[PDB]
Structure 1
Amino acid sequence: NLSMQTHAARMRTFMYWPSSVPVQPEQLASAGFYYVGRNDDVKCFCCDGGLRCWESGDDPWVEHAKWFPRCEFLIRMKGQEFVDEIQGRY
């Protein structure tokens, strides 16, 4: 995942992303995720968190904060406040 530290490199992994998945590469790459080349499995370049089974309306940033709240990339991009709220702390 060192190769995956840039937005451009992440975007390139979605070459063979299945077109039927209802979440788009741009939103995934922007939230830190790259395609691992099987089904709809993606991983974060920073925290190595894996996500799959994307559904219509899923928001990669929200899912990042839901499952991997301590990710430093996530915190730097969205802030600890956003992460806390996703985690149900106000």
Structure 2
Amino acid sequence: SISNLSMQTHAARMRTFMYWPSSVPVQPEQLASAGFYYVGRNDDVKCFCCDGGLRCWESGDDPWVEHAKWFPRCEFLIRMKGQEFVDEIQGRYPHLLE
């Protein structure tokens, strides 16, 4: 089941980015679409579904890819991007989370 149901909508996730830092190259839209909302602290975001947090976003970061890198069994991730996408990311980073 879903970890944070108040953040299940894209619109709700999007509202959380009001004070999103300008230093941070990734945009709210790409993050919100990947299931992530802002927790109000530095560049910390959390997935509404798996409750996995990411931070320290770098230029060129793709939120979906970072999602599959660290929380590959998130169901929202798998439903939206599919098990192939996730397997590919994991096969390319086989020794993260080992």
TM-score, normalised to structure 2, is: 0.89
1:45 partnered with 2:25:
no
Structure 1 CA distance for aligned equivalents of residues 15 and 53 of structure 2: 18
- State the identity %: 100
Q: Deviations over 1:15-47 (max 9, x none)?
A: 000111010000000000000000000000000
Is residue 2:5 matched to residue 1:2?
Answer: yes
Distance 2:79 2:17 in 1: 24
User: Hey, what's the Cα distance between the residues in 1 that align with 2:61 and 2:46?
Assistant: 16
Name the SS of the counterpart of 2:46 in structure 1: strand
Unaligned segments of structure 2, at least 5 residues: 94-98
Q: Assess, with a 3 A threshold, how the Cα gap between structure 1 residues 22 and 89 changes in structure 2: closer, same or farther.
A: closer
Q: CA deviation at 1:71?
A: 0.2
Take 2:92 and 2:58, find their aligned partners in 1: how far apart are those partners?
A: 25
Q: Distance in 2 between matches of 1:28 and 1:89?
A: 22
Cα shift at 1:10: 0.1
Q: Distance in 1 between matches of 2:34 and 2:50?
A: 12
User: RMSD over aligned Cα, in angstroms?
Assistant: 1.4
Q: Deviations over 1:24-75 (max 9, x none)?
A: 0000000000000000000000000000000000000000000000000000
Secondary structure in 1 aligned to 2:92? Answer: coil
Which sections of structure 1, spanning at least 5 residues, go unmatched? none
Divergent runs of 4+, >3 A: none
Q: 1:26 maps to which residue?
A: 29
- CA 1:87–1:20: 2 relative to 1, 3 Å: same
Displacement of 1:89? 6.8
